[PDB]
Design a protein around this ligand. Structure first.
Ligand code: MN
Ligand code: MN
Ligand code: ZN
Ligand code: ZN
Lengths: 602, 60, 607
DNA sequence: CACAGTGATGCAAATCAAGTGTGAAGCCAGACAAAAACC
DNA sequence: TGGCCTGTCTTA
DNA sequence: GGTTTTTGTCTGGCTTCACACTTGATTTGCATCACTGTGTAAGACAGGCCA
DNA sequence: GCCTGTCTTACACAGTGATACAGCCCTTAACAAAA
DNA sequence: TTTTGTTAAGGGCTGTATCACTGTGTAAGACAGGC
């Protein structure tokens, strides 16, 4: 029967075909497919041919010798193949192996729809203020209806975005598998639906020059699901937390725009609807179906991803050269330099909105200098609530810069030479450079960086520099200073110091105070009314930041490269649709679902 | 693929080992073949292996 | 639903049909329940239009294994511009998820590359080539060819990489092996036949403009294109191979890539002269090379047709294009060419040009510069490459249309009757013509000359249109005949083989161009200014001679290499080590592989 | 400065290939009753 | 006519 | 309550793989190399307002 | 009756993701041609 | 007696041929310095 061709087998089996179709229509409502599938699987199992039966079951589940269109999508996206390229590979492999290993282009588009915002239905209770309840919304114009007539302000920018809620929905549905499995891993039940709390790191950076060749700048507003806890009784048990918070991979894009991060008018115009949406979500519950069961989520948004320049810009504060050097407190550069450590986090978004109104209203009729001291730098109206933090890098860098200056000044013995000239200090610096090259193999550089700081902040480096210091009494002081630095460093370098270094976390304030004291006694020569934002944050606010955020390390220079990559290779060369394609592509590229396939070899 | 010199050797020597001990398991027969041939003379095996190798190479 | 329930449950719900099927199998098919259920399910799948799962089931039952040969993997990688890391991601993922190794690992692809690159097969030259090594394992070689680089010497500011020209000839022939054997078969000849094959190689060279990724960075490409292979089978030369798309970037095998300016004569000659030496050497020897087990012998014929005019002039010692000596085939001046429209012949040659450079250099009749220049016809520099300058079908059309357009404007202004006209009058004439073409012929106006304007304007319909703007009908008759002659000439320069497709057109071309020029000289006297373009001169003077020399025109066109620059930059960005010595040979190797016919066959497998 | 990302590289570890006798794993049949949802 | 406080541009 | 289903129960004798062990020459897996171009931000540097 | 770079856009086409259209093997019964 | 072809009207997936669209390379011209 099998050596026969198609018309032959149709004929010689026509009788059984009629009998089988009759039985199928009469017993299963005409579902011939299910009847033949089960018949053949059961026959295979009956003949002890479990291998072929399992492979058939897998071909019906799409797991063997045919890639699921989602896996094709993961490959294509994750390898930056264009549709033309992808189709060439698809058609070629199919022609040469006869089998359709990769799926066609229409299958990949259909698999895209599921992974893009706007596909699953959801509810907000109570309905979000000023946000549409439509759930089938995906990519929408980033201008949010900004007027474009020739009379109005000139619009020089193209941007595309998601509605912030819909994107949260898609990101949760993307991680559904991790959420269920984490519930299992905490010895909890799959079907529980009690209020899940999602913590969300909110992030914003400009991406420099994006141009393909005039500079073309881009802003990326993005988010990261940081942690999802479930409430069991009255314990909040974590069901998920991101392993690599800072990775490009889990940084879910929310809006991409072709604009300058310092173009304030445009920035507020484009970002303000997103903030409006996030405000809306701050007081509502999200109902979303996972695994057949309706689940309920509530969110905590923490804008910790903003470098200092963008913090200052969105919170109404002055530019970085200001005297008000801290975005956490009201210190001045002079105050922070004289007052070494006793500073506390003071500022808040509301305090800044009121300080703006005070600037604006001048209620006590003061002069501009008196008003500026009254509002401690807030001269513009804030429009984003940030959680300004510190980067562990900048702690190391600020410390190392101070130690470098102390080393060169201890070699020159600056206390004995108060009127030392520029060239004498320069030769001091040259002496230290030369000796550090000979002893520690450190190429003197003129721009401070992480690797130089990492190699210089060692006890052995202090011994090396002491080899050039006459007084050993000052060897004592320099070595104790470096010891204190090495005690404080783990706290801000770890990713969870309350387990990895709890002794140091405790002793941090004692150590910081002793460090500042030793600077104020033995090292008075390096006081001149100047200190950096980074050094002030390291000595004044680190324990407070760990109390608030838990970690320093956990809370984008590839952003530029990745943006440009997508634009050049995966996007229509038309102003209308390039940004659509780039945003869609980046979103797909951050899906944990496709990433799982790409890691399958583990 | 063409057999290793040791492999062709074992195909030829399976009858001697089998006739002398009939119920030796695969682990046991292979362990023996391997131990005695490892102790060994075996140059014609390597010659046959190289000849079969280059024949298979030609095979496109 | 049946699929909802367990195997015990589904067994229960289907027991009756199972018994009936066992009866049917024993009564009709010899008891093969397995085969009967398989065929039932396959045909049901085909009925629900789900052919994909049915074919996958068929292949898994046949057990036919799905494995791509490393060569096919390489063809896909090359032809889709995947870097090694990106290929490795796709490979590892497909292998992890299907558990089968459909794509091969990277080391297998490298190995497959070695076969397709110069330096792999062995060969011999009889007699050994003069001043060329007999080593056959040479691949990429430094393009400077041992050029001195010490600080005392001339400063070497360029990076270049190349193949040894015989070695590349070998690699390209081995690549075409399957096409050679199939062509012999298609000509009713024997696969094993070995009689002397002849290879007509087209040589080419061009600048690639800017290559910078962001200071300009220019590139030169030296290439060759196997145009046809014949075999002497009697006193007959049978055509067993002919390149189907000769201007494609796909068959333009890169010989030498160099980062240098095509106008930088010192570097140009330093880098190319070794190649020219190997090409010369090959002109006096026969290549023996084993194909399909049979040694074969190949004789080559190098024709340098791949040179645009600027590069022709530079390498053949002629003056720059603005010269009075406008033709690279003959000694005419622009004024002579304008006055004497049709009667010129192909008199220049590489030997004549070398000679005239010696004359220029030695000034043997002690002449003034103007007299000496006149004597040597503008060959003021020593040629260094023998070329075969030609014309492309495009410029024939372009020159004719530029003339007809100017004629149209002047005929609207009755200049045959009024000698003088202000700028405003001529501008209004041109506006009239442009409006009238936009209205009746749907011709957009254009501010610069171009091909398809010419194509669409050179129709008898446009002549009726413009005749609607001319009052005198004797001039209608004149225009209609001038266009008739145009249309009688066009086939010859457009067609692919004019000897076969339009033998009467080719036979009457010369007569027709004489009558064309006579019509212009009698009833169109006004359009004589002592000016004319090389395109128009070559079209009216040299077309039959070029066809007799080459067989055709449109196939030796300048059209294709504008993609080259793009190609180059792609390979430099995505498939190249970021180090100046290595990026170049990586682009070279990728460009070779991109041209291989073996791989292209895999990429056209569906047909 | 760091670092991204290229094609090449180099060494450790699978892997292959043959012999075959096991053990493990799943399935068959037929009368029938639990634990379950349908009027 | 400056220091020099502020914002722009440069180089590692 | 009757009337419909799912899902077990008890055996063995079956069929179909995986493992077993060796040797050494291939093949894969994986981290690494050397290397520059490019983005970014640390840090020189130009500058004009008012005293 | 100048030469010869530099500059400027016209112009075509490349090559993107989306989209529209055509061609594909069938699906009913029956004869029946090759084997 | 066992395999395939075949008709006609007509219904879905799949393959490729465009869409529209703009950046971009090459080159057709214009132009101006040779103090
Ligand atoms: Mn930034
Ligand atoms: Mn050129
Ligand atoms: Zn502070
Ligand atoms: Zn001529």
């Amino acid at each position: 029967l099998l050596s026969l061709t198609r018309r032959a087998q149709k004929h010689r089996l026509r009788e059984l075909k009629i009998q089988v179709k009759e039985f199928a229509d009469k017993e299963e409502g005409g579902d011939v497919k299910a009847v033949c599938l089960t018949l053949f699987l059961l026959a295979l199992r009956a003949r002890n041919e479990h291998r072929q039966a399992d492979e058939l079951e897998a071909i019906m589940q799409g797991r063997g010798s045919g890639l699921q269109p989602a896996v094709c999508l993961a490959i294509r996206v994750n390898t930056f193949l264009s549709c033309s390229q992808y189709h060439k590979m698809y058609r070629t492999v199919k022609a040469i192996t006869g089998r359709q290993i990769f799926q066609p282009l229409h299958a990949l588009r259909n698999a895209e729809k599921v992974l893009l915002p706007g596909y699953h239905p959801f509810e907000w209770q109570p309905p979000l203020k000023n946000v549409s309840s439509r759930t089938d919304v995906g990519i929408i114009d980033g201008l949010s209806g900004l007027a474009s007539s020739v009379d109005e302000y000139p619009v020089d920018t193209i941007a595309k975005r998601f509605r912030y809620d819909s994107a949260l929905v898609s990101a949760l549905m993307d991680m559904e598998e991790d959420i269920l499995e984490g519930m299992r891993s905490q010895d909890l039940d799959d079907y529980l639906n009690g209020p899940f709390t999602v913590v969300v790191k909110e992030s914003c950076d400009g991406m420099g020059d994006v141009s393909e060749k005039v500079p073309e700048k881009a802003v990326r507003f993005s988010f990261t699901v940081m942690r999802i806890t479930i409430e069991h009784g009255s314990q909040n048990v974590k069901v998920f937390e991101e392993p690599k918070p800072n990775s490009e991979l889990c940084c879910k894009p929310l809006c991409l725009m072709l604009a300058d991060e310092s173009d304030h008018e445009t920035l507020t115009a484009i970002l303000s609807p997103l903030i409006a949406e996030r405000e809306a979500m701050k007081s509502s519950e999200l109902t979303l179906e996972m695994g057949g069961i309706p689940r309920t989520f509530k969110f905590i948004f923490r804008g910790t991803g903003y470098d200092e320049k963008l913090v200052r810009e969105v919170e109404g504060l002055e530019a970085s050269g200001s005297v008000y050097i801290c975005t956490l407190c009201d210190t001045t550069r002079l105050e922070a330099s004289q007052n070494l450590v006793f500073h506390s986090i003071t500022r808040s978004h509301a305090e800044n909105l009121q300080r703006y109104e005070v600037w604006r209203s001048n209620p006590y009729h003061e002069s501009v200098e008196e008003l500026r001291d009254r509002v401690k730098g807030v001269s513009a109206k804030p429009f984003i609530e940030t959680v300004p933090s510190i980067d562990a890098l900048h702690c190391d860098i600020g410390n190392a810069a101070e130690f470098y200056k102390i080393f060169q000044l201890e070699i020159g013995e600056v206390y004995k030479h108060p009127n030392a000239s520029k060239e004498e200090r320069k030769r001091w610096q040259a002496t230290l450079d030369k000796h550090l090259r000979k002893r520690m193999n450190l190429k003197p550089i003129m721009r401070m960086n992480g690797n130089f700081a990492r190699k210089l902040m060692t006890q052995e480096t202090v011994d090396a520099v002491c080899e050039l210091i006459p007084s050993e009494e000052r060897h004592e002081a320099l070595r104790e200073l470096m010891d204190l630095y090495l005690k404080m460093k783990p706290v801000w370098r770890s990713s969870c110091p309350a387990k990895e270094c709890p002794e140091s976390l405790c002793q941090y304030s004692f150590n910081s105070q002793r460090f500042a004291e030793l600077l104020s006694t033995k090292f008075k020569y390096r006081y001149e009314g100047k200190i950096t934002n980074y050094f002030h944050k390291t000595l004044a606010h680190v324990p407070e930041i760990i109390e608030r955020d838990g970690s320093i390390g956990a809370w984008n220079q590839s952003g530029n490269k990745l943006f440009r990559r997508f634009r050049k290779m995966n996007a229509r060369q038309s102003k209308c649709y390039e940004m659509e394609d780039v945003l869609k592509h980046h979103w797909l590229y951050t899906s944990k679902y496709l990433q799982k396939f790409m890691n399958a070899h583990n | 693929r063409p057999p290793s010199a040791f492999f062709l050797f074992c195909s030829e020597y399976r009858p001697k080992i089998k006739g002398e001990h009939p119920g030796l398991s695969i682990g046991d027969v292979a362990k023996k073949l391997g131990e005695m041939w490892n102790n060994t003379d075996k140059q014609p095996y390597e010659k046959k292996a190289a000849k079969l190798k280059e024949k298979y190479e030609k095979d496109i």
